[PDB]
């Protein structure tokens, strides 16, 4: 006898907007000689807009139901890796420079 | 006797919009001599707009139902890898420069 | 006998907006010779706008139901990795400079 | 006999807006020769705007229900990793400089 | 017999706005030769605006229900890692400087 | 019998510039009703750039030579002339002005 | 028998600049009803840039030479002339002005 | 028999600049109804830049030479001329002015 | 038989600058109804920059030479001329002024 | 037979500057109804910068030389001329002024 009543009359819903910005990794790069690494960008974002909507309707009087909703997300990482190495670089974006040297010497 | 009633009358829903930006990896790159790495970009985003909508309807009076919804996501990584190596670079985007040297010497 | 009544009459809902900024990793970089690393950016954001909406409706008088909603997120990391190494760099973005040297000498 | 009544009449809701700023990692960088590392940026933000909305409706008179909503988030990290190393750098963004030297000598 | 009545008549709600600033990590950096590290920025912020909204409705007369809502957040870290090392740097952003030397000598 | 010895070894000359601005007479004139004269603009400028250059060689031991180099310039001027005459002008570049008269009367 | 020895070894000359601004006569004139004369602009400027340059070589032992270099410049001027005459002008660049008269009367 | 020895070894000259501003006659004049004369602008400026340069070589042992270098400049001027005459002018650059008269009367 | 020995070894000259401001005659004049004369601007400026430079070499043992260098400048001027005459002017750059008269009357 | 020995070893000269301000005649004049004359501006300035420079070399043992260097400057001036005449002027740059008269009357 559980009467569930929802009455909607003469409703007027408008202008329901959700906005998100750009998600760029390596953009607008006029520089040079540069190591640029974006390592594992993970995006679980959610942009939504609900207007006059409903969810699930479960009419279960006296039910022995079982419902499992599992979302197992695995992102395990094991890193032993040299990342972003820059060595022995002569970067001259200026003008009129003279006699610029970079020397590396290694014995073993 | 679980009467579930939903009454909608003279509804007017409008302008339900959800926007997302661009997701670019390596874009607009006029620079040179540069190591640019985007390693494993994972995107589980969701852009949605619900307007006057409903979900599931489950009329189960006295049911012994079992429902399993499993979403197992695996992204395990094992990295032992030199990533983004730049070496012995002479980068001269300027004008009129003179006598620029980069020397590397290695013994073993 | 649990009468649940929701009565809506002559409602007027408008201008429901949620905005988010840009999420850029390496953008607008005119500099050079620079190691730029964005390591594991994880985004679980949520931008939403609900206007005249409802959730789930569960009419369960005297039910022995069991509902499990598990969201297991795993991001375990083990890092033994040299990240962002810059060495033996002569960076001259100025003008008219003269006799600039960078010397590295190593014995082992 | 638990009559739950919600009566809405001649409501007028408007201008419900929530805004968020940009979340950029490495942006607008004209400098050079610089190690810039953003290590593990985690974002669980939430930007929302509810206007005339409701939550879940659970009509359960005399029910023995069990509901579990678990959100297990794991971000365990083990770091033994040299991060952000800059060495043997001659940075000359000025003009007219003369006879600038950087010497490194190592024995082992 | 627990009559719960909520009566709304001729309501007018407007201008409900919540704003947040930008959350940028490394932005607007024209300097060079500088180690800039943002290590593990975690963001659990929440920007919301509720206008004429309600929460959950649970009509449970004489129920033996059990509800568990667990949000386990794990961020355990073990760090034995040299972070932000700068060594043997000659930084000359001035003009007209002369005879600038930086010498490093190491025996072992 | 004398010897003029000039020995040049391992020279490096660069970035020699000579310039000057525009020598413009009448330019960018949106005004009206004006009288403009540029009378006799005489230009004998000499914008030169000499880099590693060398002049004449006159090896003349015991010679009776006559070398005459004459540059005779004549600009003699005689003027008895009405230059730049503006008479009986009603210049109205404003807005909404009324009843503007310029009455010029002469007899003989 | 004398010797003129000039020995140049390992020279490096750079960044030699000579300049000057515009030599403009009448430019950017939005005004009206004016009288402008630039009478006889004579220019003998000499903007030179000499870098590692060398002059004439005259090896003349015991010679009776006659070298004459004459630069005769004539600019003799005789003026009996009405220059720059502005008469009977009603210049109204303002707004809303009324009843502006300029009455000029002469007899003979 | 004398010797003029000049020995230059390992020289490095740089950054030699000579400049001057604009030599402008009539520029940026939004005013109106004016009388402007630039009478006879004579320019003999000498903006030079000499870096590592050298002059003439005259190796003349025991010679009866005659060297004459003449620069005769004539600018003789005779003026009996009405220059810059402005008469009977009603200049009204203001707003809202009324009943402005300039009455000029002469007989003979 | 004498010796003029000049020995230059390991010289380094830099950053030599000579400059001066603008030599402008009539510029930036928004005023109106004025009379402006720049009569005879004569310029003989000498903005030079000498760095590591050297003059003439005259190796003349026992010679009867005649060297004449003449720079004759003539600017003789005779003026019997009405320069800069402004008569019968009503200059009203203000706002709201009324009944402004300038009456000039003469007989013969 | 004498010896003029000049030995320069390991010299380093830098940062030599000579300058002066603008030599401007008539600039930035928003005033009106004025009479301005810059009569005969004569400039013989000498802004020089000498750094490590050297003059002439005259090696003349036992010579009967005649060296004449003449710079004859003539600026002789004779003026019988009405310069800078302003007559019968009503200058009203104020606001709201009334009934301003300037009556000039003469007979012969």
Report d(CA E80, CA D78) in Å as an integer.
8
Flag if D102 and E88 touch (Cβ within 8 Å): yes
Interface test with C, best of E2, E4, E7, E33 (most C CBs within 10 A): E33
Interface test with B, best of C32, C44, C54, C98 (most B CBs within 10 A): C32
I38, J38 Cβ separation under 8 angstroms = yes
G&I contacts, CB < 8 Å = 17
Q: Which chains touch D (3 or more CB pairs under 8 A)?
A: A, C, E, I, J
Interface contact B25, partner C, CB < 8 A: no
Report d(CA B106, CA B90) in Å as an integer.
18
Q: CB under 8 Å to D50, separation ≥6 — which residues? A: C49, C50, C51, D16, E48, E49, E50, E51, E53
Among the listed residues A14, B15, D48, D13, the one whose alpha carbon sits nearest the alpha carbon of residue C49: D48
A71, A46 Cβ separation under 8 angstroms = no
Instruction: Give the strands of the sheet with J42-43, arranged side by side.
Output: F42-43, G42-43, H42-43, I42-43, J42-43
How many other CB atoms are found less than 10 A from the CB of residue D25?
27
- Considering only CB atoms, D84 lies closest to which of E6, E64, E84, namely E84
Beta strands (DSSP E) in chain B are: 4-9, 12-13, 16-19, 26-27, 36-39, 42-43, 46-51, 57-59, 66-74, 77-79, 83-91, 98-106
Structural resolution in Å: 2.9
| Shortest CA gap H48–chain G (Å) | 5
**CA torsion, ordered D24, D25, D31, D37, to nearest 10 deg:** 180
Interface contact I18, partner D, CB < 8 A: no
Among the listed residues D90, C68, B21, the one whose alpha carbon sits nearest the alpha carbon of residue A23: B21
Interface contact I17, partner D, CB < 8 A: no
SS3 B87: strand
| Shortest CA gap A34–chain G (Å) | 29
Q: Which chains touch I (3 or more CB pairs under 8 A)?
A: C, D, G, H, J
I105, H106 Cβ separation under 8 angstroms = yes
A107 → chain D, closest CA residue: D107
Report d(CA E5, CA C4) in Å as an integer.
10
Q: Which helix (DSSP H) or strand (DSSP E) does residue E43 occupy?
A: strand E42-43
Report d(CA G13, CA F11) in Å as an integer.
8
Please provide the distance, in angstroms rounded to a whole number, between the alpha carbons at the two ends of chain I.
Answer: 87
Per-position DSSP letters for E59-73, written without gaps between them: E-TT---EEEEEEEE
- Considering only CB atoms, I14 lies closest to which of H15, H20, H96, namely H15
Give the largest Cα separation in chain A, rounded: 93
A52, C51 Cβ separation under 8 angstroms = yes
Main-chain dihedrals φ then ψ at residue D80, nearest 5 degrees: -135, 50
The phi-psi region of residue D96 (left if phi > 0; otherwise alpha if psi is between -120 and 50; otherwise beta) is left
Report d(CA J7, CA H8) in Å as an integer.
11
Q: CB under 8 Å to C32, separation ≥6 — which residues? A: A31, A32, A33, A34, A91, A93, B31, B34, B91, B93, D32
I14 → chain D, closest CA residue: D96
**CA torsion, ordered B43, B45, B47, B48, to nearest 10 deg:** 130
| Shortest CA gap C93–chain I (Å) | 18
- Considering only CB atoms, I52 lies closest to which of J53, J63, J93, namely J53
- B99: Cα within 13 Å, side-chain hemisphere: 18
Report d(CA J48, CA J50) in Å as an integer.
7
Give the largest Cα separation in chain H, rounded: 93
Interface contact C98, partner I, CB < 8 A: yes
G32, H32 Cβ separation under 8 angstroms = yes
B79, A37 Cβ separation under 8 angstroms = no
Report d(CA F64, CA F56) in Å as an integer.
18
Report d(CA I62, CA I57) in Å as an integer.
15
Main-chain dihedrals φ then ψ at residue E4, nearest 5 degrees: -105, 115
F13 → chain B, closest CA residue: B98
SS3 B105: strand
Strand partners, G80: none
F78, H81 Cβ separation under 8 angstroms = no
CA angle C18/C19/C21 to nearest 5° reads: 155
Q: Which chains touch E (3 or more CB pairs under 8 A)?
A: C, D, J
Q: Counting Cβ atoms within 10 Å, is residue E1 exposed (0-12), middle (13-18) or buried (19+)?
A: exposed
CA angle C40/B72/A20 to nearest 5° reads: 50
G16, H52 Cβ separation under 8 angstroms = no
Per-position DSSP letters for H28-44, written without gaps between them: -----S-EEEEE--EE-
Q: Helices marked H in chain G — which ranges?
A: none
Among the listed residues F69, F89, G81, C46, the one whose alpha carbon sits nearest the alpha carbon of residue A48: C46
Report d(CA B26, CA A41) in Å as an integer.
14
- Residue by residue, what is the 3-state secondary structure of chain J? CCEEEEEEEEEEEEEEEECCCCCCCEECCCCCCCEEEEECCEECCCCEEEECCCCCEEECCCCCCEEEEEEEEECCEEECCCEEEEEEEEECCCCCCEEEEEEEEECC
Report d(CA B80, CA F26) in Å as an integer.
72
- Cα distances (Å, whole numbers) of residue A96 to C97, C105, D20, D97, J39: 7, 29, 46, 12, 45
Report d(CA A42, CA D73) in Å as an integer.
14
**CA torsion, ordered D61, D66, D69, D72, to nearest 10 deg:** 160
Report d(CA E3, CA D7) in Å as an integer.
13
Interface test with H, best of G5, G30, G35, G70 (most H CBs within 10 A): G35
Q: Counting Cβ atoms within 10 Å, is residue A106 exposed (0-12), middle (13-18) or buried (19+)?
A: middle
Among the listed residues C14, D22, C45, the one whose alpha carbon sits nearest the alpha carbon of residue E16: C14
Interface contact C53, partner E, CB < 8 A: no
Q: State the DSSP code for G52.
A: S
Report d(CA H86, CA J33) in Å as an integer.
10
Q: State the DSSP code for C8.
A: E
Report d(CA J103, CA C69) in Å as an integer.
101
- Cα distances (Å, whole numbers) of residue I1 to A12, F78, G52: 113, 60, 30
Among the listed residues B48, G24, D54, A67, the one whose alpha carbon sits nearest the alpha carbon of residue C47: B48
Q: Which residues in chain A are contacts of C99 at CB distance < 8 A?
A: 98-99
Among the listed residues E28, J38, H87, the one whose alpha carbon sits nearest the alpha carbon of residue G86: H87
Report d(CA I100, CA I90) in Å as an integer.
8
Report d(CA J39, CA E46) in Å as an integer.
76
Q: Is there an interface between B and E (3+ Cβ pairs < 8 A)? A: no
Q: Helices marked H in F13-101 — which ranges?
A: none
Q: Which residues in chain G are contacts of I33 at CB distance < 8 A?
A: 91
Report d(CA H52, CA D11) in Å as an integer.
88
**CA torsion, ordered A80, A85, A88, A93, to nearest 10 deg:** 180
- H43: Cα within 13 Å, side-chain hemisphere: 30
Sign of CA dihedral G53, G58, G61, G62: negative
- F62: Cα within 13 Å, side-chain hemisphere: 3
Report d(CA E96, CA H104) in Å as an integer.
66
- Cα distances (Å, whole numbers) of residue D60 to B53, C58, C71, E59, J43: 25, 8, 25, 6, 103
CA angle C68/C70/C73 to nearest 5° reads: 175
- Cα distances (Å, whole numbers) of residue E68 to C47, E61, H51: 26, 19, 85
Per-position DSSP letters for F29-49, written without gaps between them: ----S-EEEEE--EE----EE
Per-position DSSP letters for I18-87, written without gaps between them: E------SEE-----S-EEEEE--EE----EEEES----EEE-TT---EEEEEEEEE--EEE---EEEEE
Q: CB under 8 Å to B17, separation ≥6 — which residues? A: A16, A17, A49, B49
Buried b (16+ CB within 10 A) or exposed e, G76-96: bbbbebbbbbbbbbbbbbbeb
I50 → chain H, closest CA residue: H50
A82, B85 Cβ separation under 8 angstroms = yes
Flag if E59 and C91 touch (Cβ within 8 Å): no
Beta strands (DSSP E) in chain G are: 3-18, 26-27, 35-39, 42-43, 48-51, 57-59, 66-74, 77-79, 83-91, 98-106
G51 → chain H, closest CA residue: H51
H5, G5 Cβ separation under 8 angstroms = yes
D12, E44 Cβ separation under 8 angstroms = no
Q: Which chains touch J (3 or more CB pairs under 8 A)?
A: D, E, H, I
Experimental approach: cryo-EM
Q: Which helix (DSSP H) or strand (DSSP E) does residue I105 occupy?
A: strand I98-106
Interface test with C, best of A90, A95, A98 (most C CBs within 10 A): A90
SS3 F99: strand
Q: Which residues in chain I are contacts of D96 at CB distance < 8 A?
A: 14-15
- Cα distances (Å, whole numbers) of residue J91 to G90, I33, I94, I104: 15, 10, 9, 15
């Amino acid at each position: 006898g559980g009467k569930v009543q929802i009455i909607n009359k003469k409703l007027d819903l408008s202008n329901v907007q959700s906005k998100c910005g750009s998600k760029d990794n390596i953009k607008h790069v006029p520089g040079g000689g540069s190591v640029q690494i974006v390592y594992k960008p993970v995006d679980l974002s959610k942009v939504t807009s609900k207007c006059g909507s409903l969810g699930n309707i479960h009419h279960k009087p006296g039910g022995g139901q079982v419902e499992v909703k599992s979302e197992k997300l695995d992102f395990k990482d094991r890193v032993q890796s040299k990342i972003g190495s820059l060595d022995n670089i002569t970067h001259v974006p200026g003008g009129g420079n003279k006699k610029i040297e970079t020397h590396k010497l290694t014995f073993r």
